[PDB]
């Protein structure tokens, strides 16, 4: 129905909540049997957010192979993502074991450790370079190499070492610090400036494993990031950009993990982000520099 024409119609009618509730009704429902198992109670942050059995990530160990994580595999767009929860004090070792085993090169964090006076994610990475972290359970070592702090986001350079095999790898950490829980980013230009920084780094490249994207539960703010990125990839290789349906792409994504995108305003933002980002795909190179100035990263 073409996205820009569809946007103006819904904004004039004021039916954003109705369009969103229709997506919840049509969404897939698959079993989460392993996640509900009694022994895995302390491996889940929220009892209402669980991964499906068919798309869950398995750890390479005989004891317990569980972690609250899912593989989103987008066939036509040719890109994969791993969406997980913000780790608990006891699952920090499992988190980094997954990164090693799945051969990921980048971690996208869209939340903060403490939001609204409550702990939403453990401090899984070191803040000071002289204070490295050692995860005794999985035999892994983590050290901070450098950091580049901007006004609303931070890019970190980390070194992950497998102590059993003596191998070393560089992991890039992209932390968005000003995205509130159940909220939206400040502007479409600030979101896109961040997305393209992750794209130019080489983390989303097929020579590496799937990028790890998380928040507190890893469904709300993660859904908005992944929907915008996939929609932009689809209009680049289809050669008929007007045929990309946002609502249909979100329904394909929810076949792999429950509740992607939590509010009606998060859905409205995804439209604004894709429409603005379509200008770069159309051949206008100058809009990338206009996003950097409108974001005010100083």
């Amino acid at each position: 129905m073409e996205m820009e024409k569809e946007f103006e119609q819904i904004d004039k009618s004021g039916s954003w909540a109705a369009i969103y509730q229709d997506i919840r009704h049509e969404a897939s429902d698959f079993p989460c049997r392993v996640a509900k198992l009694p022994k895995n109670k302390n491996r889940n942050r929220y009892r209402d957010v669980s991964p499906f059995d068919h798309s869950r990530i398995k750890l390479h160990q005989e004891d317990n192979d569980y972690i609250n994580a899912s593989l989103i595999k987008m066939e036509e767009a040719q890109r994969s993502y791993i969406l997980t929860q913000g780790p608990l004090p006891n699952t920090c070792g499992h988190f980094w074991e997954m990164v090693w085993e799945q051969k990921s090169r980048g971690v996208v964090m869209l939340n903060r450790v403490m939001e609204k006076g409550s702990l939403k994610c453990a401090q899984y990475w070191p803040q000071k370079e002289e204070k490295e972290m050692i995860f005794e359970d999985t035999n892994l070592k983590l050290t901070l190499i450098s950091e580049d702090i901007k006004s609303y986001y931070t890019v970190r350079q980390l070194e992950l070492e497998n102590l059993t095999t003596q191998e070393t790898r560089e992991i890039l950490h992209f932390h968005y610090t000003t995205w509130p829980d159940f909220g939206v980013p400040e502007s479409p230009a600030s979101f896109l400036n961040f997305l393209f920084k992750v794209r130019e780094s080489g983390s989303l490249s097929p020579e590496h494993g799937p990028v790890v994207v998380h928040a507190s539960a890893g469904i709300g703010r993660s859904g908005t990031f992944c929907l915008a990125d996939t929609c932009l990839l689809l209009m680049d290789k289809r050669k008929d950009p007007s045929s990309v349906d946002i609502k249909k792409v979100l329904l394909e994504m929810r076949k792999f993990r429950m509740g992607l995108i939590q509010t009606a305003d998060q859905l409205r933002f995804s439209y604004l982000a894709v429409i603005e980002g379509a200008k770069f795909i159309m051949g206008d190179s100058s809009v990338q520099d206009q996003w950097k100035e409108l974001s005010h990263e100083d």
């Binding site: 209402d48 957010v49 539960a217 509740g259």
Partner: peptide, 7 residues
């Protein structure tokens, strides 16, 4: 503790 918004 819960997260999900089921309106």
């Amino acid at each position: 503790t819960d997260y999900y918004r089921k309106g």
